[PDB]
Design a protein around this nucleic acid. Structure first.
Length: 341
RNA sequence: AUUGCAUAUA
């Protein structure tokens, strides 16, 4: 049951209702779809005084609002465009509920918004609360975004305990749908004193990751953003095994990236691989050009190839226009000869 | 993903 005021506001009997005019009914309006939207909108127009009028009523039951399907937007509003005193007050209502919040559907949205806007000191304080709950957090549909949020906003040295828990896990986590999301963030924001052990666990698993639904994602991330030496390491593993990884669903994609991102020289050595090396009757190319995955790799290959190497690959392909005609996964490889007709 | 893949609120 809602106060007669809230209802009346629902029917739209207040076209110019003001913030002041709702005093004593914040909490109620904040837990209401439209009441919530109304407050949100108003806040922006509101003076510091007006704003504080709202802050007082919500501060008292902040916890409630933070886990509320509608309330949490109101709290987030204060974390962004709000006084430093207010943010600290809210940060303070967080003390001791971080984890439960982080695993919570609306709570986690507030934690994230808080992480972005509150000072380092309250930041680190929040982070701590996750100690010994990292993995549980990482594997949480809610918790994971929070974790990703720390890694990007928080000081990397307040993060060691994270790394610490990832030891002996990197592989398990890179094959997790939420876990691989955290690994990846970590590769972008963390210190070499921390990313050294991760890239290490990863290489020692390359062959497995490259065929994992999620493992490949991590791999592609390194091929696309990592250090040249860490790329080459990956590039070393794909060599000799190009034909097989290409008809695979997930390694297919990784192979394209090795291509797309390898040194000019590596890219020559891989392109040669499918032309020189053999698969029974014809070359690997003959086999790939008609596959449902490898046909993409051929394509990518033609695109990056140096004019010099483009010719052969083409030369090698031309002799089989007869088969590719009769193959759907190869109708693009056909037209591609246009580029080279 | 277009013949081939992943990302939690009104």
């Amino acid at each position: 049951g809602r106060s007669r005021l809230l209802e009346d506001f629902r029917n739209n009997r207040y076209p110019n209702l003001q913030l002041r005019e709702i005093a004593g009914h914040i909490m109620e309006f904040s837990q209401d779809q439209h009441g919530s939207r109304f407050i949100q909108l108003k806040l922006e127009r509101a003076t510091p005084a007006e704003r504080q009028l709202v802050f007082n009523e919500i501060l008292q039951a902040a916890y409630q609002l933070m886990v509320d399907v509608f309330g949490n937007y109101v709290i987030q509003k204060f974390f962004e465009f709000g006084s430093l005193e207010q943010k600290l007050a809210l940060a303070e209502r967080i003390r001791g509920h971080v984890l439960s919040l982080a695993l919570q559907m609306y709570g986690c949205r507030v934690i994230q918004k808080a992480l972005e806007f509150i000072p380092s000191d309250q930041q680190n304080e929040m982070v701590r609360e996750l100690d010994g709950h990292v993995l549980k957090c990482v594997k949480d549909q809610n918790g994971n975004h929070v974790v990703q949020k720390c890694i990007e906003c928080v000081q990397p040295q307040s993060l060691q305990f994270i790394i610490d828990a990832f030891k002996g896990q990197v592989f398990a986590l890179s094959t997790h749908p939420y876990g691989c999301r955290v690994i990846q963030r970590i590769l972008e924001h963390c210190l070499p004193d921390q990313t050294l052990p991760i890239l290490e666990e990863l290489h020692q698993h390359t062959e497995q990751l490259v065929q994992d639904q999620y493992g490949s994602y991590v791999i592609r991330h390194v091929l696309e953003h990592g250090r040249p030496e860490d790329k080459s390491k990956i590039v070393a593993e794909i060599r000799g095994n190009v034909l097989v990884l290409s008809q695979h669903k997930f390694a297919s994609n990784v192979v394209e990236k090795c291509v797309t991102h390898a040194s000019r020289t590596e890219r020559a050595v891989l392109i040669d691989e499918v032309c020189t090396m053999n698969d029974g009757p014809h070359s690997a190319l003959y086999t790939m050009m008609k596959d449902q995955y490898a046909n993409y790799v051929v394509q990518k290959m033609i695109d990056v190839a140096e004019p010099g190497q483009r010719k052969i690959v083409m030369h090698k392909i031309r002799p089989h226009i007869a088969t590719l005609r009769k193959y759907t996964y190869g109708k693009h490889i056909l037209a591609k000869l246009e580029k080279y007709y």
